[PDB]
Design a protein around this ligand. Structure first.
Ligand code: NAG
Ligand code: NAG
Ligand code: NAG
Ligand code: NAG
Lengths: 137, 413
C-alpha cells in the first residue's frame, strides 16, 4: 500500500506533542516524506535524519549521520520515498524488517541559521519525530 | 538486431536455472562474469537481513555457458571454492585468461573496507580456478595467493571494486578503487558543473568524492593491473581513471565487446545518468563517456533518478549496460524503473538519446537491486544473461535470479 504522505512542517497536527507522529507501516508499503515549498508562512529549513532510539529520545544527531532530507530549497518540494523492504539505493546497509522500530527526527530549529544544529530543535520543542513500528499492530 | 524504436513486445526474457537453501536467508553481494564461453560467480549467504545478517558462507565458483537443450543459454558450474572465513572476504572481482578465472578480493578484519577505510589493512588475495577441473588436479583446479607487491603511487590503499574485468594478452585488468587522503586530493572547484544548477555550490563535486563530505579519504575508480608473464607472483599496479566527468569511486566494470574494451562506472553520487563508454586508452585510463540522456537509476532524496546537478550525496545502485552493436552504439541492461526505490527491473535496449525497446522482468512492485548484464553469441544469435538481485514481498528466501534474453533480429511484434 502507498501510505499517506507525511508533510515535514511545523503546522502538521500529526506530530502529537508527546509522542510525535507514530505509524505502523507494513513490509512492502511505501511512504513519502515531503518538505513543502514556500507558497501562508515562510519556508522552514530542516535536516531530517534516521536515528537510533537513544538519539530520538535525547534529540541528538551525530557527526557520522547523513540526512534523509536536506530541506533548503524554498521554491522546490523536496521528497524522500521509502519502501519498507530489504533493498534500496542506500549505501550504509540500512533497511527495514518486521517487528522493529525506526526513528526519524530533526534537531534543526526551522531557521536557515539553525539548519545544522545537532541537539534539541524541533525534535524537542515540537515533537517533530516519526516512530515507524514496522510490521506491528 | 532490431535497430528501430518500438513498443512491440519483441523481447522475451527467460528465467534460467540459477548457478547452484534455508528459510530466512539472503544470498547477497553477487558477482557474475563471462568470457569465452565460461563464467565466474560469487555470493555471500547471510542468515537474517541482506545487509547485516550473520555471514554463513562465501562461494567463489566458475563454470561453462552452454545451450541448455532448447537453444537457450544457461550456466553450468564446474568448480567451487569456499573461503574458510565468510566474514573476511569482500569486493571480489573476476578476470578470465587461458582456461582459468582469476578472482581478486579484499581481505578485511574490520568489516567492509569502504565503511572502515582508515582501519583496513589493504590486504588483497587472488584465487585462480580452472574452468575445466581435473581428477585429483590439486593446484591446477584451485590455487590461492596473497598479493604482497602492490604499487599504488599516491594512494594510501587500493582495492578491487566491481564484478569483472578484461585480459589483454597475459595482463589482467580488474575494476578497482584508490583511497586517497582527502587533504591530498587535487580538485579545482571551478570545474564543478553548476552553471545550470541554481542551488549547487562550487564545492559540491569535491565534497562528494568521499562517502561523507569530511571523510578522511576520497575514492577514485580505476584498474588493478596484473601481468601474468611476470611469473607466479606478479605485482599488482593501480591505474587511476582520468578526471573527465569524475564521480566518486564506485563499483565498475571493464569488458570486451566487439573488439574493444568498454568501461561502466556505477553512479553512486549526483551524476545519475549512465556513466559508460569505449576505453580510449587502458593505461592511463581514459573513457570516452557517452552523452546518454535516457538511462539513470534510483537514488534517495538528494540524488534521485535523473539528477544532474552537483550535490553532496553517496547513494545509488549498480545496474550495468553491455554494448551489443558498436557501429550504431546500442546497449542492453536491466534498470530499475523507479525514482528512489529499488523496484521494477526492466530489461532495456537503448542508444544515447533513445530507449529502443524494453521488457519488464517481473511486476511494478517487485523488489530489485544490483544488476549485472553480459552479452555473447549462442549458435549465431546475440543473447544477454542478466543477474538480478530480486524478490517479491512475502518470499522467505532472497536470492538473485538469472534472466536470458535473446536480442531480436526483427522489430515486428
Ligand atoms: C508550515 O507551518 C506554518 C505554521 O506553523 C505555516 O504558517 C506554513 O504555511 C506551513 N508551510 C506550508 C507551506 O504549508
Ligand atoms: C607483461 O610482461 C611482459 C614480460 O615482461 C612484457 O613483455 C609485457 O610488456 C607486459 N605487459 C604489459 C605491461 O601490459
Ligand atoms: C560527449 O560530449 C563531449 C562534448 O560535449 C565530447 O567530448 C565527447 O566525446 C562526447 N562523447 C561521445 C561518446 O560522443
Ligand atoms: C520521478 O522523477 C522525475 C524527475 O524528477 C519526475 O518528473 C517524476 O514526476 C517522478 N515521479 C514518478 C516517476 O512517479
Amino acid at each position: 500500500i502507498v501510505l499517506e504522505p507525511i508533510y515535514w512542517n511545523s503546522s502538521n497536527s500529526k506530530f502529537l506533542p508527546g509522542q510525535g507522529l507514530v505509524l505502523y507501516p507494513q513490509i512492502g508499503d511505501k511512504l513519502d516524506i515531503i518538505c513543502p515549498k514556500v507558497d501562508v508562512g515562510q519556508y522552514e529549513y530542516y535536516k531530517v535524519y534516521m536515528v537510533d532510539k537513544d538519539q530520538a529520545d535525547r534529540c541528538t544527531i551525530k557527526k557520522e549521520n547523513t540526512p534523509l532530507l536536506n530541506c533548503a530549497k524554498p521554491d522546490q518540494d523536496i521528497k524522500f520515498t521509502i519502501k519498507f523492504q530489504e533493498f534500496s539505493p542506500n549505501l550504509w546497509g540500512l533497511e527495514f524488517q518486521k517487528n522493529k522500530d525506526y526513528y526519524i527526527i530533526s534537531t534543526s530549529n526551522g531557521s536557515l541559521e539553525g539548519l545544522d544544529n545537532q541537539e534539541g530543535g524541533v525534535c524537542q520543542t515540537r515533537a517533530m519525530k516519526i516512530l515507524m513500528k514496522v510490521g506491528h499492530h | 538486431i532490431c535497430l528501430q524504436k518500438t513498443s512491440n513486445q519483441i523481447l522475451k526474457p527467460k528465467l534460467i536455472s540459477y548457478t547452484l537453501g534455508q528459510s530466512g536467508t539472503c544470498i547477497t553481494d553477487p558477482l557474475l562474469a563471462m568470457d569465452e564461453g565460461y563464467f565466474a560467480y560469487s555470493h555471500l549467504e547471510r542468515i537474517g537481513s541482506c545487509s547485516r545478517g550473520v555471514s554463513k558462507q562465501r562461494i567463489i565458483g566458475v563454470g561453462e555457458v552452454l545451450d541448455r537443450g532448447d537453444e537457450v543459454p544457461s550456466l553450468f558450474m564446474t568448480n567451487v571454492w569456499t573461503p574458510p572465513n565468510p566474514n573476511t572476504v569482500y569486493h571480489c572481482s573476476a578476470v578470465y585468461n587461458n582456461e582459468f578465472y582469476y578472482v581478486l578480493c579484499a581481505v578485511s578484519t574490520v568489516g567492509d573496507p569502504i565503511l572502515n577505510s582508515t582501519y583496513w589493512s589493504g590486504s588483497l588475495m587472488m584465487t585462480r580456478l580452472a574452468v575445466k577441473p581435473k581428477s585429483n588436479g590439486g593446484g591446477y583446479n584451485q590455487h590461492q595467493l596473497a598479493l604482497r607487491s602492490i604499487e599504488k603511487g599516491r594512494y594510501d590503499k587500493v582495492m578491487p571494486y566491481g564484478p569483472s574485468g578484461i585480459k589483454q594478452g597475459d595482463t589482467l585488468y580488474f575494476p578497482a578503487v584508490g583511497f586517497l587522503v582527502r587533504t591530498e586530493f587535487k580538485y579545482n572547484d571551478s570545474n564543478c558543473p553548476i552553471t545550470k544548477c541554481q542551488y549547487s555550490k562550487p564545492e559540491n563535486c569535491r565534497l562528494s568524492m568521499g562517502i561523507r563530505p569530511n571523510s578522511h579519504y576520497i575514492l577514485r575508480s580505476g584498474l588493478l593491473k596484473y601481468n601474468l608473464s611476470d611469473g607466479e607472483n606478479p605485482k599488482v599496479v593501480f591505474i587511476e581513471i582520468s578526471d573527465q566527468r569524475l564521480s566518486i569511486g564506485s563499483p565498475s566494470k571493464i569488458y570486451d565487446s566487439l573488439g574493444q574494451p568498454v568501461f561502466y562506472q556505477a553512479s553512486f553520487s549526483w551524476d545519475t545518468m549512465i556513466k559508460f563508454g569505449d576505453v580510449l586508452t587502458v593505461n592511463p585510463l581514459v573513457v570516452n563517456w557517452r552523452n546518454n540522456t535516457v538511462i539513470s537509476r534510483p537514488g534517495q532524496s538528494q540524488c534521485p533518478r535523473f539528477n544532474t546537478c552537483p550535490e553532496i550525496c553517496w547513494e545509488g545502485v549498480y545496474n550495468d549496460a553491455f554494448l551489443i552493436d558498436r557501429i550504431n552504439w546500442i546497449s542492453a541492461g536491466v534498470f530499475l524503473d523507479s525514482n528512489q526505490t529499488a523496484e521494477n527491473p526492466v530489461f532495456t535496449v537503448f542508444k544515447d538519446n533513445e530507449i529502443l525497446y524494453r521488457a519488464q522482468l517481473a511486476s511494478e512492485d517487485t523488489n530489485a537491486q544490483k544488476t549485472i548484464t553480459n552479452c555473447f553469441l549462442l549458435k549465431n544469435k546475440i543473447w544477454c544473461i542478466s543477474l538480478v538481485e530480486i524478490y517479491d514481498t512475502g518470499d522467505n528466501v532472497i536470492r538473485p535470479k538469472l534472466f536470458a534474453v535473446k536480442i531480436p533480429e526483427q522489430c515486428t511484434h
